[PDB]
Structure 1
Amino acid sequence: SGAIYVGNYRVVNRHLATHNDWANLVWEDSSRDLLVSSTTAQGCDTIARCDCQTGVYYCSSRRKHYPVSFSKPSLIFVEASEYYPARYQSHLMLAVGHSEPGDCGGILRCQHGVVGIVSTGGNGLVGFADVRDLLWLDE
């Protein structure tokens, strides 16, 4: 679990969005596993606007933060799950690191701000949905 709170927006994994997220929907994209909903309170987070490929992510299954080197956002094949059929997920960044399904929503940050959230994983892999291209989150 986990979300980004920026301005009057809440960014979550689309597969974990709540009834309230869908009732306050701003934008969603199944191909990215992202959903953004509106909030009444002002958020606590800053979004990075950069090309960093190193950062730190929070891993809830270890209660710890880990440093990572990650690939640039790209189209990556993701096997079928209870949430989605087998498909290519876009704007995904992979890295070597521990993750389990419940880790989705953990934030990845670089020195500039929030880069993205945990969205996929594998045997010693962790994948993050990028949010740096969503310029409208800042306005």
Structure 2
Amino acid sequence: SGAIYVGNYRVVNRHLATHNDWANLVWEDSSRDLLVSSTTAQGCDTIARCDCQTGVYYCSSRRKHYPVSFSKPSLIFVEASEYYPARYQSHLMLAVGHSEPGDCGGILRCQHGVVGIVSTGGNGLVGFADVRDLLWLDEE
């Protein structure tokens, strides 16, 4: 579990969104596994606006932050799970690292701010849903 709190927005994995998230919906995209809802309180996270390929992510199943090298956001095939059929997930970045069910929502960050959140795992790979292209998170 986990979310990004930027401005008056809450960014979560779409597959983990709550009823309150759907009832206060700003934007959602199943192909990216992202959903954004509105918040009453202002958050403290800031979004990175860059093309970094190195950063640090939080792994809840290890209680540890790990430094990683990650691929550029792209269209990647993700196997069938209990949340989605086998499909191409867009804006996904992969790295070598531990990720098991429960780790979605952990933040990946670089020197510029939050880059994205954990969205996939297994086989010694961790995948992150990028948010750096969502420029509207910084305003309104």
Structure-2 separation of matches of 1:82 and 1:66: 27
* Equivalence for 2:111: 111
Aligned-pair CA distance for 1:137 = 0.0
* Equivalence for 2:53: 53
Aligned-pair CA distance for 1:122 = 1.7
What TM-score, normalized by structure 2, do the two folds share? 0.98
The one-character-per-residue Cα deviations of 1:52-101 (angstroms, maximum 9, x if unpaired) are 00000000000000000000000000111111111000000000011101
Give runs of aligned pairs for residues 114-125 of structure 1, distance below 5 A: 114-125=114-125
What TM-score, normalized by structure 1, do the two folds share? 0.99
Cα RMSD for the two superposed structures:
0.5
Structure-2 separation of matches of 1:109 and 1:24: 26
Runs of 5+ unmatched residues, structure 2: none
Runs of 4+ aligned residues of structure 1 deviating over 3 Å after TM superposition are none
Paired residue secondary structure (1:28)? strand
Structure-1 separation of matches of 2:101 and 2:25: 24
Paired residue secondary structure (2:42)? coil
Paired residue secondary structure (2:41)? coil
How much identity, in percent, do the aligned residues show?
Answer: 100
Aligned-pair CA distance for 1:103 = 0.2
Structure-1 separation of matches of 2:135 and 2:101: 28
Q: How many residues align?
A: 139
Structure-2 separation of matches of 1:96 and 1:86: 21
